Structure 1
Amino acid sequence: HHHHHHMVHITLDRNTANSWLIISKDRRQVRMGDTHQNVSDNKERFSNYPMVLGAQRFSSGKMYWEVDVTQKEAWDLGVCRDSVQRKGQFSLSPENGFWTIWLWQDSYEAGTSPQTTLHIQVPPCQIGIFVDYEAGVVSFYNITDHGSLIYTFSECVFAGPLRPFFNVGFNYSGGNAAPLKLCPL
């Protein structure tokens, strides 16, 4: 992929974070805290899952960013509609306004309904996310393996502005405390 040149500087939006998340001062890293982080509730916060949005909103063009997933056991990454549900239970699917991939229980899967098995030969430590708004495309790249393709969603129904989407996963095991980190350009 020659997508690096559409690189965008993503930062995380505190106000959208689940109340247990800790976002770094530079708004480039997020991790699960061991408790509620002493913030007020608001209608933007994801209530049920350890999720947060990027601050940036995209309605046109080509955008690319990279995320470090080193030493995590569970996560989900991609993009979503600005209008996604925040409260209660829901599945990560294009029908619900999410275009994502995840790691769960030693398997990589695309967030389709039902989910799709991914075939990755080299477990990734950094993931590249590429959005082509006009083309209706969201693609995922394995930065650890020379930028090899992981998955492409096509014919996407964005149906409004898009936001970068992050889920650090729960830490029931004690093995998933590590952060998600936005990588430098």
Structure 2
Amino acid sequence: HHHMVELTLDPDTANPRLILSLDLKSVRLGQRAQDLPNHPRRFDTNTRVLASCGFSSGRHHWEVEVGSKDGWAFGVARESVRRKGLTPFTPEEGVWAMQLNNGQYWAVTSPERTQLNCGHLSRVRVALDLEVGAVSFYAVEDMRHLYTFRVNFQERVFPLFSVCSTGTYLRIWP
């Protein structure tokens, strides 16, 4: 029994175009925006949602089931990640993520992304280590390493999820 943190998507953060599953574990992009209460924590233009739980210390694992189609990115964000207006999806903006775009897997480095030659992903294990300052990604099938960002995190870190195209999704386990 691998001990993973119990995460729920934070509806107060979700872009209004996102459709969250009724268990708040899954996210996809809808065809149209919902009328949601204006909230300071809400991503009003970028297609993002955070978990309701953030981390200041220790080691935390969770898993993300990923769609086969382009349009998703996920990882962690610093709490101060900007919510309002169009923002860059980059480490400078406090986003540390992997992405599926044009049939290829990427670590979202800046100013150019880093192609991962990892083969098809069904489910990814995220290993957040706030003792050492790292976030690592593994393919669950054989636990092959995908990517590690090494960050001297200076604030609370939140699980981050983005879906910018219809026809794909992300789902938190457990």
* Shorter-chain TM-score above 0.5: yes
1:122 pairs with 111, 119, 124, which one? 119
Greater shift, 113-122 or 10-19, is seen at: 113-122
**Partners of 1:101 and 1:115 in 2: how far apart?**
13
How much does 1:179 deviate?
2.4
Is 1:181 the counterpart of 2:167 in the alignment? Answer: no
Greater shift, 60-69 or 4-13, is seen at: 4-13
Residue type at the aligned position of 2:44: S
Is 1:101 the counterpart of 2:69 in the alignment? Answer: no
Partner of 1:174: none
Extract unaligned runs of 5+ from structure 2.
none
Contact 2:76–2:159 (CA under 8 A) maintained in structure 1 = yes
**Partners of 1:62 and 1:6 in 2: how far apart?**
11
Partner of 2:56: 59
Query: Which is strand-richer, 1 or 2?
Result: 2
Contact 1:79–1:100 (CA under 8 A) maintained in structure 2 = yes
Q: Deviations along 1:64-92, whole A, 9 cap, x unmatched?
A: 11111133212111001111101122222
Identity %: 39
1:34 pairs with 15, 31, 35, which one? 31
Question: What TM-score do you get using the length of structure 1 for normalisation?
Answer: 0.87
Q: Deviations along 1:8-66, whole A, 9 cap, x unmatched?
A: 11110000000111212211111111111221222211122211000111000000111
Residue type at the aligned position of 1:180: L
Is 1:147 the counterpart of 2:137 in the alignment? Answer: no
1:91 pairs with 88, 91, 100, which one? 88
**Partners of 1:71 and 1:107 in 2: how far apart?**
10
1:25 pairs with 22, 25, 50, which one? 22
Question: What TM-score do you get using the length of structure 2 for normalisation?
Answer: 0.92
Partner of 1:48: 45
Query: Which is helix-richer, 1 or 2?
Result: 1
Partner of 2:110: 113
How much does 1:6 deviate?
4.6
Root-mean-square deviation (CA, aligned residues, Å) is 1.6
Contact 1:118–1:151 (CA under 8 A) maintained in structure 2 = no
Is 1:160 the counterpart of 2:155 in the alignment? Answer: yes
**Partners of 1:45 and 1:21 in 2: how far apart?**
11
Residue type at the aligned position of 2:4: M
Q: Alignment length, in residue pairs?
A: 174
